[PDB]
Amino acid sequence: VIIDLDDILQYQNEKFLQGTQADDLVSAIQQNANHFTELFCRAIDNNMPLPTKEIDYKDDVLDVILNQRRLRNERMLSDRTNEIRSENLMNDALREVVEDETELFPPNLTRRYFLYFKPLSQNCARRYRKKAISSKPLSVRQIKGDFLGQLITVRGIITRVSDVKPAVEVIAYTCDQCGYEVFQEVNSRTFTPLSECTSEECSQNQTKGQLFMSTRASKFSAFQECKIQELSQQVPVGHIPRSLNIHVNGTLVRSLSPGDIVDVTGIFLPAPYTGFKALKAGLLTETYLEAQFVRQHK
């Protein structure tokens, strides 16, 4: 899913000229830019032409799993509304009682798509000057440590590209006694397997279960990274060029050959890491960049 900034700015031109007032949204995204990922994407799942094609038998092994979790959600939803109307003492509250008495799959777990942002060109910014600060050919030397969380634009040379290998995100866990599925989200570098069970039904009982993970039910992600060397043209007269780490996730993988000239735009986030143990001054933040869009010269 590709989102520009120009149709936003075109809409933001459009609303002021025809209606009273629009909240500013270009510079709103431009500041923090990380909370705008999922808070935007859950609004997408409100409206959807869902049954628009009968499923293909050879479509996707991912597709048959999400179709279950869509259906298993609704069949479990259809059960609880039967018992409550059968035990009475407008139906919105009757709907609302069903909402909180049943454990469900989260809507973050069945997505199947991805969303990448896109920076605005100066071209429409040339017509109406607005917050066009995100798109300038900036240097790694120009990266001061005050631009954290912003949306930026850098360029350089792709150097020492790694290999693409899957990154585990969430792990499924089969109970085998209570019959639930436990889910553990990991955002750290390493993690641990967890205890024997954490069900609500295995709980408050003497004999808890003993679990194990599963492969086909977990969600993975395409992962590969590389380093960008300085452009060697704006370097000061006696300096040596540095490098910078950029993580790449999802669709945009397998798109960057080494030794090129490319415009990389993204958002600037730290990673929890410090160097040697004795050299730690107490809060040492090691940074990186997350890739969002590739525009290659040549």
Partner: protein, 284 residues
């Protein structure tokens, strides 16, 4: 059943050697070779035996020969204990080692599988990098500060597990202490690592190595740069470094669905094929 069967193995083997030994006439040896085996050992007192596999293949028509040759690891104490009663019947400190020879079938390192453990298979090769003489304990005298600190006891096997749970001291099962380093019976051993023959190696393949320990009498019989034949027996040593091998790793997470409650001291295992022997002839 199995208490009876290995004891039936014990008694039939006790029946076997106590019978006639060699069929041959006065032209040659007449009788009682295994009976002369102890009586000649009584002259020298070296406390071991040289018994044939071929004479054991004669009497029971291979029914008993195909009883021992599969699970010898099952049959350690039964072969030793009955022979001990054969000695005290005929003879008067006594410690024993059982040696075999004349194996009809000899294989190589490539003909070894995990289904061959406990069984007897003869392997020849190339001896390289002998090592020194070092002892082995197998007789722990280890009990707590409670009065009965005299437990001549377990860890005869391949485990450093000295204290038994149920003594009748004031000490409990959790009570454990060091071994008495002066009152035990030891034996020594060396550790050579044999290389495979060059007359059997296939294409594209280097010769292979394997560790083997000779305990007690069979020390110093080894020679680097020699061809030898071995005891058929085989053991397995626990390994460490086979991590991230990759593979589905076995574990020892014990049951918790037993005793009712109101942390996780579990372990894993990853071993390696080793080899053990007691008779080494050096033909070749």
């Amino acid at each position: 059943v199995d208490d009876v069967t290995g004891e039936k193995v014990r008694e039939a083997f006790e029946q076997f050697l106590e019978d006639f030994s060699v069929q041959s006439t006065d032209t040659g040896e007449v009788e009682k070779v295994y009976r002369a085996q102890i009586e000649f050992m009584k002259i020298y007192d070296l406390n071991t035996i040289y018994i044939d596999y071929q004479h054991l293949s004669m009497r029971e028509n291979g029914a008993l020969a195909m009883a021992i040759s599969e699970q010898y690891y099952r049959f350690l104490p039964f072969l030793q204990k009955g022979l001990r009663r054969v000695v005290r019947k005929y003879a008067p400190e006594r410690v024993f080692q059982i040696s075999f020879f004349n194996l009809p079938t000899v294989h190589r390192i490539r003909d070894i599988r995990s289904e061959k453990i406990g069984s007897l298979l003869s392997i020849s090769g190339t001896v390289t990098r002998t090592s020194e003489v070092r002892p082995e304990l197998y007789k722990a005298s280890f009990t707590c500060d409670m009065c009965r600190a005299i437990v001549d006891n377990v860890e005869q096997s391949f485990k450093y597990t000295e204290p038994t749970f149920c003594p009748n001291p004031s000490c409990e099962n959790r009570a454990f202490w060091t071994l008495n380093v002066t009152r035990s019976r030891f034996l020594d051993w060396q550790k050579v690592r044999i290389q495979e023959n060059a007359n059997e190696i296939p294409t594209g393949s280097m010769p292979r190595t394997l560790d083997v320990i000779l305990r007690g009498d069979s020390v110093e019989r080894a020679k680097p740069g020699d061809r030898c034949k071995f005891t058929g027996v085989e053991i397995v040593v626990p390994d460490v470094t086979q991590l991230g091998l990759p593979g589905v790793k076995p574990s020892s997470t014990l049951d918790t669905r037993g005793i009712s409650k109101t942390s996780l001291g579990v372990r894993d295992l990853t071993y390696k094929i080793s080899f053990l022997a007691c008779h080494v002839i050096s033909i070749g």
